[PDB]
Amino acid sequence: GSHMEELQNKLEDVVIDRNLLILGRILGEGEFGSVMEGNLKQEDGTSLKVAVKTMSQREIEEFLSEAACMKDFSHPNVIRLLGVCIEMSSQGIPKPMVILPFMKYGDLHTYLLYSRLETGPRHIPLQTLLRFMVDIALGMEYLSNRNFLHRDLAARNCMLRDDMTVCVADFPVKWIAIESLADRVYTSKSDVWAFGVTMWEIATRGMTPYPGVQNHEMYDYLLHGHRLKQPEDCLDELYEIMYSCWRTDPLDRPTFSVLRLQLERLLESLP
Numbered sequence: 001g002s003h004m005e006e007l008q009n010k011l012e013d014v015v016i017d018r019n020l021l022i023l024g025r026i027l028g029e030g031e032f033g034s035v036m037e038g039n040l041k042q043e044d045g046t047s048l049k050v051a052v053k054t055m056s057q058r059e060i061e062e063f064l065s066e067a068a069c070m071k072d073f074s075h076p077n078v079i080r081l082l083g084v085c086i087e088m089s090s091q092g093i094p095k096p097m098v099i100l101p102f103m104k105y106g107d108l109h110t111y112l113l114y115s116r117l118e119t120g121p122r123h124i125p126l127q128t129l130l131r132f133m134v135d136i137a138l139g140m141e142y143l144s145n146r147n148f149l150h151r152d153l154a155a156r157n158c159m160l161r162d163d164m165t166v167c168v169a170d171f172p173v174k175w176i177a178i179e180s181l182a183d184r185v186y187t188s189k190s191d192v193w194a195f196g197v198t199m200w201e202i203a204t205r206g207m208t209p210y211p212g213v214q215n216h217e218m219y220d221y222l223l224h225g226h227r228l229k230q231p232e233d234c235l236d237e238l239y240e241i242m243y244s245c246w247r248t249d250p251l252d253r254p255t256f257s258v259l260r261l262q263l264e265r266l267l268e269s270l271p
């Protein structure tokens with residue numbers, strides 16, 4: 001059928017030959033895996049700076065399928081997946097690799113924190129904070145419009161491009177909507193909740209959500225109607241937008257499209 005035809009098309013495009021790739025220095029390293037800088041040789045003989053994340057048969061095919069879908073996304077506020085390679089361990093375990101364009105500014109969360117230090121990015125003005133929120137909304141609007149559920153939206157999963165555009169990516173209790181803590185259920189309105197938390201991380205220039213509240217106490221804290229507090233110097237109108245993301249009933253939360261225009265309107269009004 002066409003459903004399967006489109007899957008086979010996407011799969012054909014996503015794989016990159018291992019020898020078109022050279023891996024350089026480690027950028028990050030954990031239990032999950034590692035991220036390294038690299039170069040990728042393209043069709044025209046020229047090379048591109050990339051980041052490469054490195055993570056039985058079923059798992060690999062799941063990974064390829066998922067990758068194939070990500071690569072087909074095309075939006076300036078969603079990270080572009082250039083492709084994937086599968087390397088094999090000397091103990092016969094596959095080592096899957098995801099290849100993305102290298103973004104020197106790194107993840108939004110760290111950049112917010114560096115901005116509060118003298119050597120870092122300079123102080124980020126309000127207009128630029130809102131622009132980051134608008135960028136994220138635009139990426140999420142695109143993804144929700146094709147019913148992709150993110151499941152882990154947070155500032156640590158947003159990346160900054162060379163031209164300061166933010167894009168949605170994906171490398172957790174305090175980002176999880178109240179209904180998904182309770183009923184282990186997840187919709188786009190659960191993503192809206194996480195977006196609200198992400199807005200608050202941006203407006204606080206990288207604070208951890210819910211100071212004074214431990215993860216084990218989070219469901220109960222929210223059950224009693226408590227929410228993230230309004231940041232110091234956060235405009236009342238901006239706070240209302242984020243607060244709307246945490247309404248107990250998912251159907252009462254605005255969509256990403258509604259949010260995006262609310263944020264654009266606020267941004268245009270700023271003197």
Ligand SMILES: CCOc1cn(-c2ccc(F)cc2C)nc1C(=O)Nc1ccc(Oc2ccnc3cc(OC)c(OC)cc23)c(F)c1
Pocket residue numbers: 027028035050051052053062063064066067070079081098100101102103104105106107159168169170171
């Ligand atoms: C919205 C869904 O997006 C995804 C789905 N998946 C996914 C999930 C499951 C699966 F089976 C398959 C895929 C493809 N991965 C992503 C994704 O965005 N991955 C990703 C994101 C960021 C990564 O890191 C970097 C990229 C670019 N420049 C960096 C620069 C750095 O320092 C200066 C840097 O320091 C650490 C890290 C950088 C990265 F290596 C990988």
Ligand SMILES: [Cl-]
Pocket residue numbers: 021022023
């Ligand atoms: Cl190499």
Ligand SMILES: [Cl-]
Pocket residue numbers: 206207208
């Ligand atoms: Cl902090």
Ligand SMILES: [Cl-]
Pocket residue numbers: 209210211227228229
């Ligand atoms: Cl709080």
